[PDB]
């Protein structure tokens, strides 16, 4: 068996209770195999939408001797889940935040009985924190890591019967991540804010500035102010 990437290892680290899981758009079923093998999961669905990855995942499951504990299924999003599967945890990793959000909204019925989501968006993480507020899922854990010079965020959610209400900083940055203030968190956001300040200068010095670009500047100022507020610097 191959070792998981640090990204997928972090995602897997949130599967803990010998759970029934579904990994949507699974990366070769590596994570389902790792979690079944090490007993942190008792059953997995590995979902795939197209041929190459569906076949690669089937072959990994067979190679692991895990065909009795892992079902590889072809389907769009949560179409691979059925009520009778009694899934406890859903993993959706390695996709953009908007796509993940769409998967969660179109597949809303399939969230019946699910008690944990582990989501790893490659862009627009804030979209999923907004979803969490609109649908009353609490964020219970988050992580931020760097692998191959790319920064990845992971969030873990659970249903809440009480309203979930975030601040705009919690949506943009992550409620757990902004409490933690890790070195990767601080470096990522200072990096982005430096780019936004640079963009403002570039636009401002190409007079005349269009009404479209004035609005862009306002947006960039807002984002920089959010970072300054969370870092308490600048």
């Amino acid at each position: 068996e191959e070792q998981l990437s640090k990204r997928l290892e972090k995602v897997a680290s949130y599967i803990t209770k010998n759970e029934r899981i579904a990994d949507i758009g699974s990366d070769h079923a590596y994570l389902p195999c790792f979690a079944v093998k090490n007993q942190t999961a008792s059953f997995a669905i590995a979902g795939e939408v197209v041929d190459g990855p569906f076949q690669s995942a089937q072959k990994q499951v067979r190679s692991s001797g895990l065909t009795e504990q892992i079902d590889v299924r072809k389907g769009n999003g949560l179409a691979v889940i059925e009520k009778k599967d009694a899934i406890d945890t859903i993993v959706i990793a390695g996709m953009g935040g908007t796509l993940i959000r769409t998967i969660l909204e179109e597949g809303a019925a399939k969230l019946a009985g699910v008690t944990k989501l582990i989501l790893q968006p490659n862009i627009a993480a804030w979209q999923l924190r907004e979803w969490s507020e609109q649908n009353n899922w609490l964020i219970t854990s988050e992580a931020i890591l760097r692998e191959d010079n790319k920064v990845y965020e992971i969030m873990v959610l659970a249903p809440s019967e009480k309203p979930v209400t975030w601040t705009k900083q919690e949506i943009f940055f992550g409620p757990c991540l902004l409490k933690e203030q890790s070195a990767i968190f601080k470096s990522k956001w200072r990096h982005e804010a430096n780019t936004w300040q640079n963009i403002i200068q570039t636009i401002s010095n190409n007079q005349p500035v269009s009404t479209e670009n004035q609005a862009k500047i306002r947006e960039l100022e807002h984002k920089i102010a959010l970072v300054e507020d969370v870092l308490k610097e600048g």
Side-chain angles (χ1 to χ4, degrees), residues 1-61 63-82 84-234:
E1 216 91 315
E2 294 207 86
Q3 166 183 332
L4 291 181
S5 67
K6 294 279 196 277
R7 179 183 65 96
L8 290 172
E9 180 174 62
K10 189 62 164 178
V11 168
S13 78
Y14 295 114
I15 297 169
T16 57
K17 299 153 62 197
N18 192 231
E19 332 182 346
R20 300 174 65 77
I21 74 175
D23 188 12
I24 310 296
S26 188
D27 188 351
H28 296 69
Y30 292 142
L31 176 152
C33 289
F34 169 88
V36 167
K37 268 273 224 306
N38 75 10
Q39 304 179 71
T40 59
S42 59
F43 170 76
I45 298 166
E48 307 288 353
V49 68
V50 296
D51 280 349
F54 174 66
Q55 271 124 78
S56 278
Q58 279 173 307
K59 288 181 177 281
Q60 171 66 43
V61 169
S63 175
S64 290
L66 293 177
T67 63
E68 286 189 63
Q69 280 181 284
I70 307 173
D71 288 343
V72 183
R73 297 182 194 176
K74 181 130 79 162
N76 195 17
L78 310 187
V80 299
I81 294 178
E82 224 72 62
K84 65 171 157 305
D85 292 316
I87 296 304
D88 302 300
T89 299
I90 302 176
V91 178
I92 316 176
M95 292 185 216
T98 308
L99 181 45
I100 297 177
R101 188 167 184 170
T102 298
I103 285 170
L104 294 170
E105 296 173 338
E106 294 175 355
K110 306 300 192 48
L111 297 172
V114 176
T115 52
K116 183 159 55 181
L117 305 170
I118 301 161
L119 308 180
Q120 185 273 303
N122 284 348
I123 188 174
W126 69 267
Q127 289 269 10
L128 295 174
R129 307 199 189 88
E130 192 163 50
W131 179 90
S132 134
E133 176 168 267
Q134 288 171 0
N135 294 273
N136 290 341
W137 289 66
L138 200 55
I139 299 163
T140 56
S141 288
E142 303 180 294
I144 194 167
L145 60 94
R146 184 165 18 243
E147 182 167 39
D148 298 334
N149 202 33
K150 270 165 289 167
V151 180
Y152 298 101
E153 292 155 297
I154 298 164
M155 67 180 78
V156 181
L157 299 93
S160 182
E161 53 166 299
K162 282 161 54 58
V164 177
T165 62
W166 295 126
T167 62
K168 60 187 178 157
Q169 294 86 343
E170 292 174 319
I171 281 167
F172 194 99
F173 299 108
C176 307
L177 297 179
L178 72 85
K179 291 205 215 147
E180 181 192 24
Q181 298 279 337
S182 77
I184 291 162
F185 177 91
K186 293 190 185 282
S187 71
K188 168 191 174 55
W189 292 114
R190 181 68 259 169
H191 179 79
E192 299 318 331
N194 284 342
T195 288
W196 293 328
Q197 297 169 351
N198 294 341
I199 294 168
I200 290 168
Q201 162 132 254
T202 294
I203 294 168
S204 291
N205 301 317
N206 300 165
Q207 328 253 246
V209 182
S210 69
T211 306
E212 294 81 350
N213 283 333
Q214 288 290 7
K216 185 154 202 208
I217 288 184
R218 264 180 278 111
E219 175 160 61
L220 293 164
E221 289 167 337
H222 178 54
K223 297 185 212 252
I224 294 157
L226 291 165
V227 169
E228 290 179 335
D229 181 60
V230 305
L231 299 182
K232 287 304 169 190
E233 303 214 348

